[PDB]
Amino acid sequence: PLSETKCTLKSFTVEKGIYQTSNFRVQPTESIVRFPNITNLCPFGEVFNATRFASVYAWNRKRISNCVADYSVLYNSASFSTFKCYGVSPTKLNDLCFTNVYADSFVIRGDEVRQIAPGQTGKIADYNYKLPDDFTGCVIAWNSNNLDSKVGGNYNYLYRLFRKSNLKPFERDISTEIYQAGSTPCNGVEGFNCYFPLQSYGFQPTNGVGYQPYRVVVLSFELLHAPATVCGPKKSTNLVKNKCVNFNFNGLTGTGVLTESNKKFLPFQQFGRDIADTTDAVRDPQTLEILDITPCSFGGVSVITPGTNTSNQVAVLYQDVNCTTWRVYSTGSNVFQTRAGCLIGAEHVNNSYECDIPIGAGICASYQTQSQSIIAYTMSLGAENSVAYSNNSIAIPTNFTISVTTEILPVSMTKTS
Amino acid sequence: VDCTMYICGDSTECSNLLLQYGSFCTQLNRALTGIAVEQDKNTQEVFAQVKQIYKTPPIKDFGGFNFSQILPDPSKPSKRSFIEDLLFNKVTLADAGFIKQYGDCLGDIAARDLICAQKFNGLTVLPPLLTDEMIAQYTSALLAGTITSGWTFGAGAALQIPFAMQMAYRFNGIGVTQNVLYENQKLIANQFNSAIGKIQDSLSSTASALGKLQDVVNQNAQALNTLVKQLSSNFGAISSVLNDILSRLDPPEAEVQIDRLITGRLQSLQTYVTQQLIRAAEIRASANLAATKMSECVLGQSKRVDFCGKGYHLMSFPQSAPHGVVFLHVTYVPAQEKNFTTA
Amino acid sequence: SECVLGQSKRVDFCGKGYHLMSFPQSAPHGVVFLHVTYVPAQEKNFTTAPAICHDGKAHFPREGVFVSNGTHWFVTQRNFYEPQIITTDNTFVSGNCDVVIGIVNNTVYDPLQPELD
Amino acid sequence: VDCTMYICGDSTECSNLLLQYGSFCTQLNRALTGIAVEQDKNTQEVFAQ
Ligand SMILES: *[C@@H]1O[C@H](CO)[C@@H](O[C@@H]2O[C@H](CO)[C@@H](O)[C@H](O)[C@H]2NC(C)=O)[C@H](O)[C@H]1NC(C)=O
Ligand SMILES: *[C@@H]1O[C@H](CO)[C@@H](O[C@@H]2O[C@H](CO)[C@@H](O)[C@H](O)[C@H]2NC(C)=O)[C@H](O)[C@H]1NC(C)=O
Ligand SMILES: *[C@@H]1O[C@H](CO)[C@@H](O[C@@H]2O[C@H](CO)[C@@H](O)[C@H](O)[C@H]2NC(C)=O)[C@H](O)[C@H]1NC(C)=O
Ligand SMILES: *[C@@H]1O[C@H](CO)[C@@H](O[C@@H]2O[C@H](CO)[C@@H](O)[C@H](O)[C@H]2NC(C)=O)[C@H](O)[C@H]1NC(C)=O
Ligand SMILES: *[C@@H]1O[C@H](CO)[C@@H](O[C@@H]2O[C@H](CO)[C@@H](O)[C@H](O)[C@H]2NC(C)=O)[C@H](O)[C@H]1NC(C)=O
Ligand SMILES: *[C@@H]1O[C@H](CO)[C@@H](O[C@@H]2O[C@H](CO)[C@@H](O)[C@H](O)[C@H]2NC(C)=O)[C@H](O)[C@H]1NC(C)=O
Ligand SMILES: *[C@@H]1O[C@H](CO)[C@@H](O[C@@H]2O[C@H](CO)[C@@H](O)[C@H](O)[C@H]2NC(C)=O)[C@H](O)[C@H]1NC(C)=O
Ligand SMILES: *[C@@H]1O[C@H](CO)[C@@H](O[C@@H]2O[C@H](CO)[C@@H](O)[C@H](O)[C@H]2NC(C)=O)[C@H](O)[C@H]1NC(C)=O
Ligand SMILES: *[C@@H]1O[C@H](CO)[C@@H](O[C@@H]2O[C@H](CO)[C@@H](O)[C@H](O)[C@H]2NC(C)=O)[C@H](O)[C@H]1NC(C)=O
Ligand SMILES: *[C@@H]1O[C@H](CO)[C@@H](O[C@@H]2O[C@H](CO)[C@@H](O)[C@H](O)[C@H]2NC(C)=O)[C@H](O)[C@H]1NC(C)=O
Ligand SMILES: CCCCC/C=C/C/C=C/CCCCCCCC(=O)O
Ligand SMILES: *[C@@H]1O[C@H](CO)[C@@H](O)[C@H](O)[C@H]1NC(C)=O
């Protein structure tokens, strides 16, 4: 605490006085990791290894649940020319659980891969597949030029070219109603100013890169605000109660003390929040207990310092302890408890004196000989006196003193500009 | 304020970023410390005008006057007078004793108890240097002073004077011959005693008079609760929670989001300090006036027409209350006039 | 203005004691005052009474207090003991001896009758 | 001060964003209201004796 005062003040010398410091803190001692005990691997072999993909015209949407997202399984043979995460840094994918996970899946032309990202325009972004402005997932794609290509062309892949308006996020439209152009009425018949809305792709093996087919998978998911059943590969640990710990509950990390709670969460609520939106309760993923989480730090400390040019002894006042183990930095032989807190290191005396180095709530301190130490004492209030007040007695001065005293009053400040 | 706890409570990555933006954290505390010191000086200036703590005389024969509701009640463990007891009971403080142990908040309760919620976010309250018992001793001395010595209990050594004579001189001060006090001494004592009884009952029945002291308490409590509530603001960040940012983002991206929250949190703290500082200027002005009235209404006889209540000032007695001083001002008001011819 | 250019009667202005006079002095960024005050000293306790009973009429001090030692009553000013003989010049007469509480019996001196005799 | 009009006058997208940064808008008005009340008290104290 004395050094903390010196750093705060940018000085190697501290004047006699009371200095405030940081609230008393403790460190976490161990890390608790809790995930639901999911044993199945996610269907990477179906999402990325399908015999057939949907056309962008009518894209598929697969729901993923109850699995481990161990994507390292792709490293032995998959290759992805495009990969970008929007709602999470990719390096964090293994410490998190995901919920509401869906994999959209389709085939597009290579020059169209860039239109998948949110905020883009073009025939795919406007008429076939659109991500929302606030998309929170990951987009992955690869060059399937030896799977989706055919020598005479592969005409099984379609895209929408004509529409009267743009799509909203994640909408599909598989209507084949003929498109009317040029304000020229059309009764379902291809012709002048009337078009079948869909067109095929070529995808011959001899086309240049921009015309090779690409497989696109979009993984849409949400993080940290709901129960989750798709979760990364990090291993769990045992849970330790009533100690300061580090933790990870389904991807939500932080530190604090885990205790049993009387809060009862509704079946669909995974986490709670306090008045300032800080998580203060969680449902444990394996045993469904509700735990409260409290901060590890708490308290308040101040240091009683004789000038450092006189002595290096200090006394420390702890505002949040009773001292009758303790949330203190150390315990010495001199422990005094008062209304202002627990004072450790000062000797206490039964005398009273004029105040110096005020502590609070009736207590002051000073550095004294009897071979010197810091002493805590109560304040005097001047000295006691009395009057006679007999009902027939009057005191009258017989002499006087003319005295001169001084008084100082500041008048002005340094003017600045 | 623990300006690190308010911004980066229990978070290493945030705490290290905060070091660069660190001169501001220190500056906020310097201003608050200066205010905190001034508040004890204000209390001392208003009440500690007497270095001689006079005991209540053993003789209660103050003519026909009572004063027992004003003087300390010896049956209590405290030295509060009956009227002070009422004043202390009506002004409500958020809590008392200033100690909450960690174990006391180790549960769901931490989120329901506003004081605990303030402590966990780095906001604390420091105890006053003087206690209620010490203030009661100062008010006791002032009363012993004016009940027995009057004018001269200050400006020199206290001299005793019979109580009736003391008022006789206060009447000459007003401009009424002393003969009135002696001839009407029984009437005067009875009117005084009845007036005190009315004050006692008035204070017992209606607490609205004390709203000024209650307002000081409520305003500070609200400012601290506001700082806790403002923690939820995003300030342009993805989330107001550092843990959400740190879990989902890598360091270089997290740093942007954290910096937005750090700047925003300092903005809340600077706003707080400025408001406390302005309010401190206002409370000081009140304290200076209170000190002036103590000296001019209690330690002497003011002749200022609008001091010490309405009427001609005759005498006064201070009483303490949480966060302030309440005065009982005794004035002389003429009555039942008749119109006469003059020249 | 109130301590230097005039004589304040406010009890807590111009230092402690009764204000008598003052002199300003300047200093960097402010003013320092030298305040001269009068403080009473060396008090003694005397017997007192609110009035004196003469011939049934009650005599009140014109100014000051009626004060006495073991054998005689005198009238003095309040802030500096200076006993004077109680005479009809130094007192108000009103009411009577059956009204004032604490009235004592003490002959009041008539300054003129002995000159006329 | 209508602290919404000053920031997002006639603008829906701005107004909704401002809700997150909303405790500050309220706090400004509380301070101004307190001042406004004091100003009538000042007039009354000087003249209504
Ligand atoms: C996707 O399919 C490929 C085959 O086309 C799988 O890769 C083969 O895995 C076996 C077993 O480990 C190896 O013996 C083969 O040599 C691999 N083939 C190639 C070309 O590398 C791949 O594992 C499947 N991916 C997923 C996620 O199931
Ligand atoms: C959702 O359906 C509505 C209703 O059919 C579409 O709005 C109409 O669009 C046609 C042109 O295709 C206009 O002639 C109509 O006047 C519109 N009606 C209304 C009530 O606005 C809307 O465009 C469709 N949404 C999407 C994304 O396609
Ligand atoms: C420290 O804790 C003790 C209790 O362990 C407090 O002392 C008690 O105070 C109550 C009145 O509030 C008494 O009825 C008990 O008899 C006391 N118990 C003991 C063992 O003394 C003590 O007040 C606390 N310290 C501070 C500064 O608050
Ligand atoms: C001052 O007033 C109090 C009442 O407020 C007087 O105390 C009461 O005295 C009667 C007897 O005459 C008792 O029956 C009551 O119980 C007492 N009440 C209380 C609250 O103590 C007191 O005697 C008066 N003192 C003087 C000097 O007049
Ligand atoms: C001055 O007014 C007071 C009342 O304010 C008079 O005193 C009251 O007299 C009535 C009888 O007429 C009694 O019943 C009350 O008990 C008295 N009150 C008190 C407090 O003693 C007083 O007599 C009037 N004096 C003059 C000269 O008119
Ligand atoms: C002073 O004398 C007047 C009469 O000359 C008393 O009567 C009032 O006089 C005023 C001034 O002309 C009128 O406005 C009122 O209407 C009169 N009163 C009534 C009831 O008619 C007045 O009361 C006397 N003052 C005192 C103190 O007795
Ligand atoms: C006034 O007279 C008293 C004696 O009646 C003097 O003595 C003090 O009286 C008080 C009141 O009873 C006691 O508490 C003190 O202990 C007495 N003093 C001593 C030394 O015993 C008192 O000194 C006289 N005042 C003056 C100014 O002379
Ligand atoms: C009270 O004061 C009076 C006046 O000073 C004293 O009276 C005089 O005492 C001297 C002796 O010291 C005599 O020579 C005078 O003749 C006395 N004057 C009168 C008018 O009698 C008196 O002695 C003092 N009394 C006490 C008890 O101290
Ligand atoms: C001052 O107090 C004394 C008592 O300390 C009062 O003395 C009483 O005087 C009357 C005569 O007027 C006697 O009958 C009583 O016996 C005395 N009482 C005692 C206990 O001896 C004195 O009257 C009071 N003086 C004033 C002005 O109040
Ligand atoms: C002042 O002197 C008168 C006498 O002139 C005293 O009055 C007498 O007191 C006695 C005892 O109570 C009565 O028996 C007499 O009848 C009273 N006489 C008259 C004329 O009233 C009076 O007490 C003395 N006063 C003081 C303060 O000593
Ligand atoms: C020369 C035109 C007039 C210039 C004025 C500015 C016009 C703005 C339009 C720019 C062209 C945007 C084309 C985007 C690519 C669509 C390709 C596709 O989806 O397949
Ligand atoms: C497995 O999951 C069930 C249901 O959530 C739970 O009760 C059980 O304790 C878990 N077990 C382990 C790690 O053995």
Residue numbers in the entry:
A (entry chain A): 295 to 618, 632 to 677, 689 to 735
B (entry chain C): 736 to 1078
C (entry chain A): 1030 to 1146
D (entry chain B): 736 to 784
Give the original sentences from the paper that presented this experimental model.
The SARS-CoV-2 spike (S) trimeric glycoprotein is a focus of vaccine development because it is the primary target of host immune defenses. Like other type 1 fusion proteins, the SARS-CoV-2 S prefusion trimer is metastable and undergoes structural rearrangement from a prefusion to a postfusion conformation upon S-protein receptor binding and cleavage. Here, we describe the structure of a leading SARS-CoV-2 S vaccine candidate (NVAX-CoV2373) based on a full-length (FL) S, residues 1 to 1273, which includes the transmembrane (TM) and the cytoplasmic tail (CT). The final construct, SARS-CoV-2-3Q-2P, was also modified at the S1/S2 polybasic cleavage site from RRAR to QQAQ to render it protease resistant, along with two proline substitutions at residues K986 and V987 in the S2 fusion machinery core for enhanced stability.
The FL spikes, expressed and purified from insect cells, were formulated in 0.01% (v/v) polysorbate 80 (PS 80) detergent. We next performed single-particle cryo–electron microscopy (cryo-EM) on the spike formulated in PS 80 detergent. Our final atomic model contains residues 14 to 1146 with breaks only in the flexible loop (619 to 631) and the cleavage site (678 to 688). The S1 NTD rotated ~14° relative to published models, whereas the CTD and subdomains showed minor local rearrangements. In our 3Q-2P-FL structure, we observed a shift in residues flanking the 615 to 635 loop, resulting in a salt bridge between residue D614 on one protomer and K854 on a neighboring protomer. This observation is particularly notable given the increased prevalence of D614→G (D614G) mutation in the emerging SARS-CoV-2 strains and its potential role in viral transmission and pathogenesis. The first density was buried within a hydrophobic pocket of the CTD. The main chain carboxyl group of linoleic acid interacts with the R408 and Q409 residues of the RBD from the adjacent protomer, potentially stabilizing the observed RBD-down state and consistent with a recent report. The location of the PS 80 ligand provides a possible explanation for the S1 shift seen in our FL trimer density. PS 80 is specific to the formulation of the Novavax 3Q-2P-FL immunogen, but other ligands may also bind this pocket and provide a potential target for drug design against SARS-CoV-2.
